[PDB]
Amino acid sequence: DCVRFWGKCSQTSDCCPHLACKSKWPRNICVWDGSV
Numbered sequence: 001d002c003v004r005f006w007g008k009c010s011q012t013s014d015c016c017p018h019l020a021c022k023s024k025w026p027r028n029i030c031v032w033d034g035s036v
Contacts, residue, residue, distance in 0.1 A: 005032040 003015030007030045011021050015030030023029045 003030050
């Protein structure tokens with residue numbers, strides 16, 4: 001079950017490859033990768 005922006009994540013095998021496991025508040029999720 002992939003995960004989208006802001007989704008409880010640990011480090012590997014959590015949200016979809018289109019995001020990363022680093023939040024700016026929840027501190028425990030996967031945020032979409034938007035490296036402008």
